[PDB]
Amino acid sequence: CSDIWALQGKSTETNPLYWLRAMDCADRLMPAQSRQQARQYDDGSWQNTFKQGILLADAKITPYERRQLVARIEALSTEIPAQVRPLYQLWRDGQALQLQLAEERQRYSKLQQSSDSELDTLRQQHHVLQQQLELTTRKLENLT
Amino acid sequence: CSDIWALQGKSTETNPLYWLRAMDCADRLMPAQSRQQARQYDDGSWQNTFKQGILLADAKITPYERRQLVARIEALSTEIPAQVRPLYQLWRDGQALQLQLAEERQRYSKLQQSSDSELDTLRQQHHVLQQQLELTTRKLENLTDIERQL
Numbered sequence: 001c002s003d004i005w006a007l008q009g010k011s012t013e014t015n016p017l018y019w020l021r022a023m024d025c026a027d028r029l030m031p032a033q034s035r036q037q038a039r040q041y042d043d044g045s046w047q048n049t050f051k052q053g054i055l056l057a058d059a060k061i062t063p064y065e066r067r068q069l070v071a072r073i074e075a076l077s078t079e080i081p082a083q084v085r086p087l088y089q090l091w092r093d094g095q096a097l098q099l100q101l102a103e104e105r106q107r108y109s110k111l112q113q114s115s116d117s118e119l120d121t122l123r124q125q126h127h128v129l130q131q132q133l134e135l136t137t138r139k140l141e142n143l144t
Numbered sequence: 145c146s147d148i149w150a151l152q153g154k155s156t157e158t159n160p161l162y163w164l165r166a167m168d169c170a171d172r173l174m175p176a177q178s179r180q181q182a183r184q185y186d187d188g189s190w191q192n193t194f195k196q197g198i199l200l201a202d203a204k205i206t207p208y209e210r211r212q213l214v215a216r217i218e219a220l221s222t223e224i225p226a227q228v229r230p231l232y233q234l235w236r237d238g239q240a241l242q243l244q245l246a247e248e249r250q251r252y253s254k255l256q257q258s259s260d261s262e263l264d265t266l267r268q269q270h271h272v273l274q275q276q277l278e279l280t281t282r283k284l285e286n287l288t289d290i291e292r293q294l
Contacts, residue, residue, distance in 0.1 A: 016161060016164055020160055023234070024230040085168075086165070086167050086168040087231075087234075091234060093238055094237055094238055097241035097242065097245065098241060100245060101241060101248065104245065104248045104249065107252065108248065111259070115259040118263065119262065119263065119266065126266070126269065126270065126273070129273050129274065130273070133276060136277065136281055136284055137280065139284055140280065140284055140287070143288070144291050
């Protein structure tokens with residue numbers, strides 16, 4: 001695997017088996033090791049953005065890190081060699097769906113947060129208003 | 145693309161470029177085309193069921209149906225050749241995330257539905273009790289002004 005990460009050249013870029021082996025090899029990595037190794041592949045070329053993304057995707061990233069990753073992955077779609085596009089697309093679909101799932105979960109937290117607090121606020125009012133009604137009914141009886 | 149689905153044998157089942165091209169050819173199909181082709185690969189072998197999952201995954205199917213497809217090929221997943229395995233785990237996790245997203249959208253609909261209805265009953269109770277309190281409060285004050293002046 002050590003050599004798979006090092007390989008460069010038109011022969012390997014355009015070969016879907018090279019990229020499949022890289023994705024296979026990233027899986028064998030402890031997530032801290034994946035994150036650390038991704039840091040090397042930052043020359044901004046499309047070959048290196050794809051390697052870095054492949055490594056970062058096993059690295060246990062925050063939703064915000066994935067948002068940026070999927071943005072970078074999509075950016076370079078016009079440079080993906082034709083014969084590599086199916087593999088790239090399936091791997092990218094995987095990152096986008098994991099990104100949608102973090103988003104839906106965030107949507108579900110905002111609903112639960114806001115609806116539960118407006119619920120609790122209503123019950124606060126249902127007690128304050130209730131007490132006021134009774135007190136008022138009391139002053140009406142103790143009218144002279 | 146039309147020939148690609150017919151192929152069989154060890155030289156192609158162990159072949160990740162074969163299955164990549166098949167994943168690409170599936171995209172070119174419309175759902176009716178997609179379901180018609182899947183019907184032709186039903187025997188239950190892992191090749192045929194991996195073929196059916198690939199064709200139907202994007203054929204406008206239901207989550208229950210998607211779950212059924214994935215379980216059929218998952219039950220046979222120990223058989224997938226070494227060279228195809230990382231391609232399979234890629235394709236299964238895609239299907240698996242789709243299943244999670246449908247579960248999460250249902251869970252969300254539920255909470256929206258249930259909190260909404262609980263939010264409407266309590267908001268109505270709040271308005272009604274407000275009007276009760278306004279009426280009793282103006283009555284108290286009307287009677288207080290009278291006694292005060294008397």
